[PDB]
Amino acid sequence: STLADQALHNNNVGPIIRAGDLVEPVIETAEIDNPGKEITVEDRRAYVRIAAEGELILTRKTLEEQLGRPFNMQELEINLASFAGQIQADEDQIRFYFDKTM
Amino acid sequence: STLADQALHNNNVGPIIRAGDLVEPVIETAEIDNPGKEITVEDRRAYVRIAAEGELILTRKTLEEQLGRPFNMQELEINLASFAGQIQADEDQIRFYFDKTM
Amino acid sequence: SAFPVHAAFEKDFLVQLVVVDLNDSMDQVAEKVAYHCVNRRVAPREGVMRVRKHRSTELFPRDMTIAESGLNPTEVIDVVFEE
Amino acid sequence: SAFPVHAAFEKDFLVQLVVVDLNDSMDQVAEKVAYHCVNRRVAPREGVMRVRKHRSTELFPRDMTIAESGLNPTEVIDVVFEE
Amino acid sequence: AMHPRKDWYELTRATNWTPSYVTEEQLFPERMSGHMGIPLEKWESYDEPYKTSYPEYVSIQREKDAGAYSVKAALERAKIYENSDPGWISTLKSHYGAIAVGEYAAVTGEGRMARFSKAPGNRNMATFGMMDELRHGQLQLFFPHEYCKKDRQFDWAWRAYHSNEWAAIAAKHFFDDIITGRDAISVAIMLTFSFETGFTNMQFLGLAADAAEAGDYTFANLISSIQTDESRHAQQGGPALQLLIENGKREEAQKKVDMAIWRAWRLFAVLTGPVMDYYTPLEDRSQSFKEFMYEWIIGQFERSLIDLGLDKPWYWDLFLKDIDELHHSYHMGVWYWRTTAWWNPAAGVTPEERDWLEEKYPGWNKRWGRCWDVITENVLNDRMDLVSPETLPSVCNMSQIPLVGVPGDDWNIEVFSLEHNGRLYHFGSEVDRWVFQQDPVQYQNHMNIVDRFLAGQIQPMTLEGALKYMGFQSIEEMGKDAHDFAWADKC
Amino acid sequence: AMHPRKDWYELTRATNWTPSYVTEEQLFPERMSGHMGIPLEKWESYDEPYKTSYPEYVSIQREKDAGAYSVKAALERAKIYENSDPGWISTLKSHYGAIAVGEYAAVTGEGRMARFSKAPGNRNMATFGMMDELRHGQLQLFFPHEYCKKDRQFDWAWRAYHSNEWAAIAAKHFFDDIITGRDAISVAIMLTFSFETGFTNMQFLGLAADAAEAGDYTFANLISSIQTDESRHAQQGGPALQLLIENGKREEAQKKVDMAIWRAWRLFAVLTGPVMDYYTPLEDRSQSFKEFMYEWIIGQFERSLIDLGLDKPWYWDLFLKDIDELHHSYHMGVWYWRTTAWWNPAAGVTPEERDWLEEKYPGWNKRWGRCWDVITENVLNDRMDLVSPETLPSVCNMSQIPLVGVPGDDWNIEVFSLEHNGRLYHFGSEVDRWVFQQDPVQYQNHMNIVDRFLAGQIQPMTLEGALKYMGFQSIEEMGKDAHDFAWADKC
Amino acid sequence: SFESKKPMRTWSHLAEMRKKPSEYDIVSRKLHYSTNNPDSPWELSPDSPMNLWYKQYRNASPLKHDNWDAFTDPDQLVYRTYNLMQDGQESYVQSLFDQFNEREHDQMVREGWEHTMARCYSPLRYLFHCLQMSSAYVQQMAPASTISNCCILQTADSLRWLTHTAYRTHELSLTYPDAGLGEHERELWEKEPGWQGLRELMEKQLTAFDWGEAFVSLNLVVKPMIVESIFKPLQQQAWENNDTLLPLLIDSQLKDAERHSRWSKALVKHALENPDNHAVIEGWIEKWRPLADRAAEAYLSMLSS
Amino acid sequence: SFESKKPMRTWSHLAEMRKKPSEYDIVSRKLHYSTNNPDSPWELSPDSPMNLWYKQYRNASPLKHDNWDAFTDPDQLVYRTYNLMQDGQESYVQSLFDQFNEREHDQMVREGWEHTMARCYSPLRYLFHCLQMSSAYVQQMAPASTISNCCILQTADSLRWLTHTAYRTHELSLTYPDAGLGEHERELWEKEPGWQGLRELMEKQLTAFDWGEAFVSLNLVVKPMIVESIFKPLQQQAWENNDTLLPLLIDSQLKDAERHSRWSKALVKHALENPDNHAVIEGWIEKWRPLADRAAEAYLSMLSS
C-alpha cells in the first residue's frame, strides 16, 4: 500500500489529449503558458497525459499560435479525452487545478 | 502488340471508386441499375475498378438505398477517383458510356 | 434426494455448484466435488479429503451423511486435506 | 585541347559525357570511355576496343587521332569490340 | 456581432420556478428526483464546470463524428479482422457486446436527470448527455455491424443485452442499478461521478492505448472520441456532490459513491482485466491492468474524489488487494467456461506471457500458475475433456459474477453469505454484501442465473439447456479458445 | 424550395459577349488564348460534361478535406516513417518533391484558361480547377511538412522546384511546356486531357494501390482524394478537342495530344517506373509498372481517346516497346547516380526481386541483369568506388533525362541528334526530336544541365560542383542506397 | 441440439428484412431490453421501485400495441444526420443574429415593442424548458427505441429554442436596458395572468406519468397549441412592429415543430393499427384540450394588450 | 566541401522565423519558382513566347519590390479555411433563398420592381464574370504565391456572385415570366447605355496586361467603385421596393468584397515600403478613375430611371 499511497498523494493536473493534431500543440502550450512549472508528459500512443503540479493553464491565444490555424477554446473538446484536476473553462482559457495539496 | 491490341479493344465503362464507404454500395448499385449486364470488379485495395460493356448507369435513388443514408448524386465526387468511358451526370443519375464499339 | 451445495476445493480458484445426495457420506461428498477440480485445475495429491462448513475449523466426520450434518441446501462447504 | 564527346559503350545502358583530348588515338579514346563502364556496369572481356561514330558501320582506325577523325565536340560515338 | 456565451449563459439555466398548480413534491417526486428534501432554491447554486450551448454542441459533435467515420472508412481494407491476433478480435467482440446497448441505456439515466433534477444547470447538461449517449450507442452498433457478415459473434453487439447470457446479466444488473433504476441525484452520483469520471477511462482510453499498439486505429480513434463526450457530461456529478455536502447530506453522498465504485470495480475486473492482461497480445500491452488501475483509478480518480471533499472508501485496503488478485481468477473462470461467452477468450499463458505476468504480479506462478499448469498439461496430453466444465460456477448475488479466490500455494477463498427474508444469498466480497444491505428492496427478489437453474427455470438442467437459455442461437456463437490451443505449441 | 441546377445552370455560363471597346483579338490574344481563329460564337457550343456549381463545390470540398486531414491526424503514431521499408519512404520523398509545387504551378494553367479561353463553360470549370490545384499544392506541402524534423530530404517537397537538381529540371521543363508556357487551348488539350486524364492516374491511383498494400493509408487516402478532383477538372479537355475537330482543327489537336502524351510518358517512366518496380517492397507491388500502364494508359486512356474521335499516336509501336524497356534503364541510372537525387533509390535486385522482374519482363536477367550482376559483385567484394560515378550522363535536350538504351546480351542504344541554328542537340527518342521540331522557338535556346556544365556555368566542374549547383545544402540530403546495401546480404 | 448457421448480413432481428438495412435501422431499432420481461423491466428485484414505476406507467398504459418496436421515424434521423441538419439550421440562425445585430435591427423596431417582447417573448424560456423536461420524460418511458429517439431529438430541439430565447433576451436588453429583459421573466411566468394558463397546463402535463398520456398531451395537444397560438401570432405581431428578425427565427423553430408533429402523427398511425387505441387517444385529447385552449386564450389576450 | 546539418523544424525558407510556422506559412509562401531566374521565368528557351510575356508584364512592371514574397494575406486564408468560411456563408445564403421562396417573397415586391431587376440586376452576371476573368489574370501574373492565392480566392468569390445572380435571375423569372429575365441580359450588357460605361471599363481593364496595373485598376479602382455605386445603391433601391432578400444577399457579397479590399490594401502597404511605388500606384489610380467614374454615373442614371 506504500505504492498506492504514493500514487494517491500527487497534485498532478492537466489534460489527457487523444492521438491527433492537438498533442504537440497542447504540450507546447502547457510549457509556454505555465512558465516556471515543470510540465510532465506520459505518452501512451492513443493518448498523452500532460501534467503540472497544482495548476495548469492553457490559453486559447497560445494554443492557436502553437496549432498554427484559427482555434476557438471550445474546440479542444474534440481532443480532450480526459483530464486530471478540477476544470474551469471559458472562451479565453482552460484551467486544471486542485483546491487541496496532498 | 497482341497484348496491347487486346487491351485497347475493350468497351469497358464505369466508375473507379476509392477505398471507403462507397465501394460496396456502388458495386451493388451497378448490379441493380444495369440488369442483364455483367458487372466486373477489379479490387486494387486503394480503389476498385467497376465496369460493364458499353454503358453503366448509377441512379441516385438506388445508390441511396444501397448506401443506407441520405445521398445527393454530386456527393459521389467524394469517392469517384476516376472512370472509364464518357460521363453524363445530373441530379438523378450518372451514365458512363462509349459512342463507339471496338 | 438431490441436495445442491456450493463447494470450494482446496487450491482451486472458485466455488462451484455440486449436487450431492441427502444420504451421501462426507467421503462421498468430497469425491463428487473433487471430480470437478482435481486434474482440471488442481493437482492430485496423497491424503484424505475432508469436508467442513465454509471457513469453519471443525471437520465433519468422514462417515457422517449430509442428512446427519444439519447442512441446508445451497450452503457453502470446503473440501480440504487433513493437516 | 580538351574535347568533350558523348560515348556509348557496348553492353552498357547509357550514353555518358567523356572528355578526351584533341590528340588522343582511338585506342586511347576507347580506354578513357571504358574507364567509366567496364567493371562498373559492363563485364570485362577479351578483344580489341574500337571507336565509331554513333550507329555508323565504319570503324575509325586504331591509330587515328580525334583531330584527324573530323569529329566535332559533343558528337556521339560508340565503343565496341571487333566482330 | 455575436455576444459571448458568458454574457447570456445564465439565462439558459434560469428555468426554476415555484409551482402553484401542483406541489413541488408532485413535480419532483423523491423516488424519481432524489432531492433528499433539499428545497428548490438550494439547487440553483448548482454550477456545471464544463459548459456548452446548443449551437456549439451541434457544430462540434458534427466535427467529432466526421472524424470517427472518416477514419473507419479509410481503414476498411487494413486487414484488421484477417490479420489481427484472435485475442484482439475477442477484445472487440467483448467490448461492443458489453457496451453498445448499455450506452443506449445511459440515455435513460441522462433523461432521468433532464426531467427530475431540481438543478436547472443539471437538466440542461443532462440534455446534452442524452444526446452524447445516443451518439455512443449508435457508433458502437454501427462500427461492429460490418463484421456481422464475417462472424456471428459480432451479432452480440446488438444481442447481448437482449439475452440471459451470464455476462450480459452482470452488465444489466449493474447498469440497471446505477443508471436506469434510481432517482436523478443517485444517477448524478453513481453514473456521472463514480462510473464516468472513475472507471470508463480504463475501457475507453486504457484500452485505446492497447488498440493503438495493436495497430487498430479505427477502434482506438473511436473510443477515444467517445471519451471526449464522457469528459464533459461526467462533470454533472461533482457539483451535485458538492451541493449535497453543503446541505448536510455528506453521509448519504459518500455511501452512494462507495457503492457505485465497488459495483463498477467488479464488472471492470471481469471485462477489462482479462482483456488487458491476457487477450491483448503481449507485445501490445501498453501497461498491465494493475498499472492502468493505479494511473486512472488511484492517481487520477481517487485524488479528484479527495479534492472534492469526500473520503477514501471504507473498503480501500480490500480494493487494493483485489486489484492484485481478482481479475486473474475472473480470467481463469471466463476461459474455463468459455463456451458460455460470446467472445473467444485467449488463455494468455505461454511461457513468455507467464514471465510477464510474474513480473507484473510477483507470485503469480505459485498461485494461478498452479492451475494453468494442470490445464496446460491436459492440453499437451490431448485430455480435452478436462478443459471443459461439467458443472456451474457459484455466482455472486450482487455482481452476478462467479465466486472466486486465490488458488495455488496460498489458497484462500471466502464467500460472504446472508440470510434475508427466508432466503440464503451469497456474495463474493464483504462489500458486495454491504451493497445489498444498503438497499435490500432493490435486490431482494432478484434471482441470479444459478438461483434460476436450481428453481427449475432453466430447462433442461444441463450445459446445453443453460447455453440455450443464455440465448446462443448456433454453435459458432459459443466461445472457444482464441487460438484453438495453438498456444500449447509454445509450451 | 430550391430550384434544381439544371434549370439555372445555363445562366452561369451565359457570359460571352461581343466586344466593342476593344477588339475580340485584343481581348483574347492568340498567343494567350490559342483559339486558332475560331470565332467567339463557335465556342459557346462548349459543354463541360462534369459540372458543379459554387455552393456545391465549397460544401463537397469541405467534406473531402475533413476526411484527408482526419485520417492523417488519426494515423500520426502508426510508425510509418520508423517501420516502413526505406524504399517506401523514398517513394514518399520522390512523390512530394516531384509533385507538390508542380500542383501549385497547375493553378496557373487553370488560370490561363479562366482568363483566356473563349468558351464560357471552360472559364468557369477552370475557376474550380484553379481552386482544386491550390488544394493539391497545399495538401502536398502540409503532409510532408511534419517529416522535416525527421529528415532533411523532406525539405525537397518545398525545395525541389526552386532547385537545378536534374529531376526538378526535367519536371519544370515538362510542366512549363504543357502547363504554364502555352495558350489556354493548348493547356486544355495538353494538361487537362493528355496529362490529367491520361497519366496522373498512374501516380495518384496506381501508386495508391501500392501504398495501401504497404499499409500507408494516410498517403493512399490523400492521393486518391486528390484524384477525385482531377477526375472533374480534367474533363475540360475533351469538349475542347471535340470543338476543335468540329471546326476543322483535327490535325492541330492531334499533334498537341501526341506531343503531350510522349512528354508525360518520359517523365512518368523516370518517376513512377522505378517506384513501382523497384522502390516499393516486392510484397506491396499490386501490379507491375507495365501492368498498370496497360490498365490506365492503354485500356482506359487510349480507348477514351479513340472514342472522342482522335487517332492512336503515330508513335504507338515505339511507345509499347518503351513500356517494356525504358524505366528499367532509367532506374539503373537514377540509382547509379543516386547521389544527385533527393531521395534514396532502392536497387531492388535481390534474387527474389530479380525473379519477379523476370516474370514480369521476360529476358530481364539477360539485359539489365547483366549490369546488376557487375554491380552486385562489386558490392559483395566491397569495391564501393565502382558503384559511384566519376562522370556525367549524357542528357536529352527535350526530356532532360539521361540518354539510355537496352544493356546486356542484345545491347541497343540510339541517340537522335539534330543540328539547328548552329547548335547540336541530342534526343533520347525519335519522338523527343519530333517534339522539338514541332515548336523550336519553345526550346531552341534552352540549355540542359550537361550543356551548362560544358559552357562553364557550373563551377567548379566536378561532381561536388554539380551537386552544389543542384542545390544540395548538406551531405544528408544527397541520395544513397535505400538500404545501405543491406540487400547484398540476400545475394 | 444446436444448429449450425452462417453469418448474417446484418443483426439477427433485421435479417428477415427484404431491403438492405439502412443506417437508421442498424443503429435505432429494438434497443430497449427493458420491454423484454413484463414482470421485470429492469434486471433487479421485480418489485424494486423503478420496476414498479415502469410496470405501472409503461407496461400498463391503456395505449397498447403488440409491436411498438416496428415504429419508424418518418425522417429516419440518427444522431449523425440530426447534427448535420441542425448545424445547418443553427449556423443559419447564428448568421441571422450576427447580420441583424450589425444592422442594428433592434433599434428600428416600433416604439414599445421591447415591452411586448419582455412580457410575451422572454418568459418563453420557461415554457420551452417545460417542453424539454416533458420530452425527456416521454423519452425515458416510451416502449420502443425508435420512439425514444424521436423524443431525444425533440428534447434537444426544445433546448435549442430555449437557447434562442435566452440569447435574444440578452441581446434585446443591450438596446433596451430598462424593460426588465433578463430580469423579470420568472415573476411574469409565476404571476402574470397571460402566463398562468400555460403554467397550469405544463405543471399538470409534467405530472402525467403514463407514457401514452404523456405523449398524447405533449405532442398532440400542447405542442400544436404552441404553434397555432404562440409561434404564429408572435410572427404576426413582429410584422406589425417592424421586427423582421423574429419571424425568420420563428420560421426556423417551426421547422423543428413540424418535424415533431410528423413523427407524432406517424406514431398515432402505428398505434391505430390497434382499433382499441382510437378511443384511448381521443379520450386523452378531449381531456387536455380545455387546458390547452385556456392557456392559448390567456396568452393571446396578453399579447393583444 | 559540404557541411553536415541537422533536420529543420520546418522548410528551409521558414527556418529563420522566430514564431512556429502557421498552416498558412507552410502551404502558401514562396511557391512561384518562376521568379527565381530573371532571364528565364519558365524552364524553356529564354525567349519562348511565355517567357517574353512574363519578362515584360511581370518582371518589368514599374511596380517594384525586392521581396514580394514577404507579402502576407491579412486573413491568412488557405484553401481549407476558405471553404469552411464560404460553406458557412453559402449555406446561409442558400437557406435565405429557400425560406424567402417558401414565403413567396418575389410576389410581394413593389409593382414594376421586376423590370428594374431585369435591367439593372440580372446583367450583373456579365460584370461579375469580368471580375472573375480579371482576378484570374492577376493570379497568374502576380510575383508572389501569397499574392496569387488572394487572387485565386477572389476569382472564386467572383464566380460565387455570378452564380447568385444566375440563380436569382432564374428564380425571379418564375414569378415574372414576361420581363425578359434570363433572356435579354446580353442585349442589355451590349446595347443599354447604363451598362456601356461598365462594359468599356472592363474591356479596357481586361487588356491591361502589366501585373501591377492589372492589380491596381481591378482592386483599387474598379472593385471599390462596384461597392459604392452598384452594391449599396441596389440595397437602397431594394429597400424602397419591398425587396428584403436582395439587401441580405448583397450584405453577404459585401463581406467578400471587404475581404478583397483588405488584402489589396495590405499589398499596397507592402509595396509602399518602396518609396518609388507611391507615384506608380497613384498614377495608375488617376489613369483609371475617370473610366470608373463614368461607369458608375451611367449605371446610377439607369438605376434611377
Ligand SMILES: Cc1ccc(O)cc1
Ligand atoms: C475546452 C472547453 C472550452 C470551453 C468550455 O466552456 C469548456 C471546455
Ligand SMILES: Cc1ccc(O)cc1
Ligand atoms: C457525381 C456527379 C453528379 C452530378 C454531376 O453533375 C457530376 C458528377
Ligand SMILES: Cc1ccc(O)cc1
Ligand atoms: C455502458 C456505458 C454507459 C455509459 C457510458 O458513459 C459508458 C458505457
Ligand SMILES: Cc1ccc(O)cc1
Ligand atoms: C504536377 C501536377 C500538376 C497537376 C496535376 O493535376 C497533378 C500533378
Ligand SMILES: [Fe+3]
Ligand atoms: Fe457513453
Ligand SMILES: [Fe+3]
Ligand atoms: Fe457517458
Ligand SMILES: [Fe+3]
Ligand atoms: Fe492536381
Ligand SMILES: [Fe+3]
Ligand atoms: Fe489536376
